[PDB]
Design a protein around this ligand. Sequence first.
Ligand code: AMP
Ligand code: AMP
Ligand code: CL
Ligand code: CL
Ligand code: MG
Ligand code: MG
Lengths: 419, 419
Amino acid sequence: MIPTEEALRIVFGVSKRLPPVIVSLYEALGKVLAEDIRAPDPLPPYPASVKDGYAVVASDGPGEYPVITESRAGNDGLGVTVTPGTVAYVTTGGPIPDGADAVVQVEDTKVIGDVSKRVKILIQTKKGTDIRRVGCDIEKDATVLTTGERIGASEIGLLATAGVTMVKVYPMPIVAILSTGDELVEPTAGTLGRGQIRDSNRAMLVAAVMQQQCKVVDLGIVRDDRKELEKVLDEAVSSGVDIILTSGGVSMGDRDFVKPLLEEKGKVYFSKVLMKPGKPLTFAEIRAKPGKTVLAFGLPGNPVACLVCFNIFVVPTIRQLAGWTSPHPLRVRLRLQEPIKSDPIRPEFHRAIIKWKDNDGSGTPGFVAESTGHQMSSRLLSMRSANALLELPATGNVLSAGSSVSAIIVSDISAFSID
Amino acid sequence: MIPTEEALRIVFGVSKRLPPVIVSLYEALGKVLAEDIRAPDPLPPYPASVKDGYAVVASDGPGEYPVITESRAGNDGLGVTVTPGTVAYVTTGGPIPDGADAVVQVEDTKVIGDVSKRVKILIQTKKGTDIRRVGCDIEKDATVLTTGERIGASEIGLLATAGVTMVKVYPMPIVAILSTGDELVEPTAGTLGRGQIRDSNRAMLVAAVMQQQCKVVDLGIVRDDRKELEKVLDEAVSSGVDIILTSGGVSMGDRDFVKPLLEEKGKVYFSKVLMKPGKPLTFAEIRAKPGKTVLAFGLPGNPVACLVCFNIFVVPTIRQLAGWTSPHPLRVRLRLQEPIKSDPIRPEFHRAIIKWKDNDGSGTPGFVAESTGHQMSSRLLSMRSANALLELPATGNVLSAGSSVSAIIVSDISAFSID
Ligand SMILES: Nc1ncnc2c1ncn2[C@@H]1O[C@H](COP(=O)(O)O)[C@@H](O)[C@H]1O
Ligand SMILES: Nc1ncnc2c1ncn2[C@@H]1O[C@H](COP(=O)(O)O)[C@@H](O)[C@H]1O
Ligand SMILES: [Cl-]
Ligand SMILES: [Cl-]
Ligand SMILES: [Mg+2]
Ligand SMILES: [Mg+2]
């Protein structure tokens, strides 16, 4: 039995980033860049107006002038030179005609006459005012995005600015998922027979892998039969998947075949971890027959321990495979809203609902946590709405309300319900 | 011109939750529940062993006993009664045979004899030990999920436990997106002609709407022509979409038709907001010809102001339409890593890269922020990697390094890179 910190280190040491692929612009969203992106031209590529108004010769100053051209886009004002004593109408983003060196916004002007157009400039402007010089936002050949950067909406915007519609990125791993047990029935079952339960772990894990943006290979329910589980694992290993997730069949039962089958097919690095909830967790590396590596997690059958192990061990593995330079989850410090008894031997991953408060109890703003209640590993209601795992050390003492603890954030911090 | 707080309030007051729909189990992920979910049977539905070991009569105590049955699943041990002086083998999750009232884990036992099986119980156990009574995790008819609850992986697990494979939920709004401008070209363009730029806002907004899990209707580039924009808007309004996003054509230019076209098709609630970056932002409610409501955001053309307006005003609108009871973004308090000059008139949404530190500068853990640099509205590089918008009030003073500010978190807090 090893501590969770050592188990993570082993997983990180074994897990390798996947080979990069070439995807389309919208397929690149969520993925980590596998190449630098340089701007092929400047932004703006032409001197552009910041305002709707008039392009002027700044040294002319206030006065009445003829409007010699209008410039909004493309070739507007091409070949026209704004000389001292003249102006040109411009819209925001419009190219500045040759000779003009500043822009006066329309609110600082007044149109004069009926009908040949004439305008009164009402202020004294300075050279360069309200003009974006060539490349002031992005210089030609500047690096706008770099390898290792995760692509979000503004990064998609930067790729489109630079005219990149096919992107080199690290792909997401493909994950196979199966459940084990003679007691299981499909979640479509109505009336349950004696000694039956609905398979809940498979759909839970399929959903958790979908939240990580990975393709899922659903291998269904496998019975407690060594030859049948071996066949499904052999098929999963040769199918092309990167990660295999099983649940159940890893405790001390006489028909728990996951651990010995993974020892036979590949290298098992550990099978037991010092933690609450649970204990059994097999991690193995299998080489598929040529040729590639497949990572296997023999997750515990108890629903809570199954999901807690996914959150702590599988999520950073998916991220590492997908090329994330920072795969660790966000850890914050927070205050307890109620007392919690820690375990004397096992450090706990206590499920909690956390929120940011203007006063965390100590007079200053901060995160606070409420327990989800009874933490029994068979009680999936303890995972309901839980957005964090409080890391409670094995002191055996009662941590009182108001004391501070470390907490792992497990669900999108930007989707957090406010206080 | 109105403050951002009033503009949000108007948007919230106009925005209505969409009619609920019935979806499949995996389509329900990410969606808000539109009905309560009750367990049709208890969990476990039979008295279940917590351990791999032996089901005993607790009052027998340590001694040697015959193993009268084996119970792992279904009908194992049906009709067998464990009487005082006998035991039954059990695996974790196995049904407890009639008559047994406790379980002794296999580590507290020893198999005796060769071959009729016999086992030595090594401890004195207490009635009920290591048995999950019927319904101890979930009681029959208990409410496991309620209306207004967002479905994550554990909620999918709870639906599968309860045998629910078709779920009533609030759907995501469908969003139409278009760009405006005679200066625009597609992001596939190579060499740009004079007075041209690649359309970056459309792909940026498509990606931002994909991050919010909404279907996108891409309406392309529309030119600065009143009749053409009217036709595209009329087609978008009658297409069945819930939200229309345009960008550009909302400043003071003589060919900026978005605002007057939205005034003509529906009700414009506001067109100008006191904020940095930007100023123009049109919000309108259109009634489609029978019949349903369509919300329109005339977003600014400047890339930064376009995305900032999406993050602050469009994201909570999508969430409200999708039935979120808490659509507001997460706001935290944090310390500045460097000095920042606030504006004298406009409150700023200053882009920043934030992270949680063990020491935020004041000796206690907390969030800290670095500016993304120059905040010019034309500079999309100021949005690069920005996971927060610092809310800097309009005091005109220099906020020094180490001072505290409010910050809006705009990208998945659980995807935050650690310090
Ligand atoms: N789709 C777009 N992508 C990039 N820049 C844009 C887009 N639409 C408008 N702009 C720019 O944003 C500024 C304001 O646009 P407008 O309100 O149409 O004058 C101008 O500098 C435009 O060139
Ligand atoms: N797919 C599953 N869904 C729900 N419960 C499970 C699943 N697989 C195993 N279990 C339960 O988890 C516990 C441990 O499983 P095992 O390691 O196979 O003994 C038992 O109580 C099982 O009935
Ligand atoms: Cl436990
Ligand atoms: Cl601005
Ligand atoms: Mg089992
Ligand atoms: Mg325009």
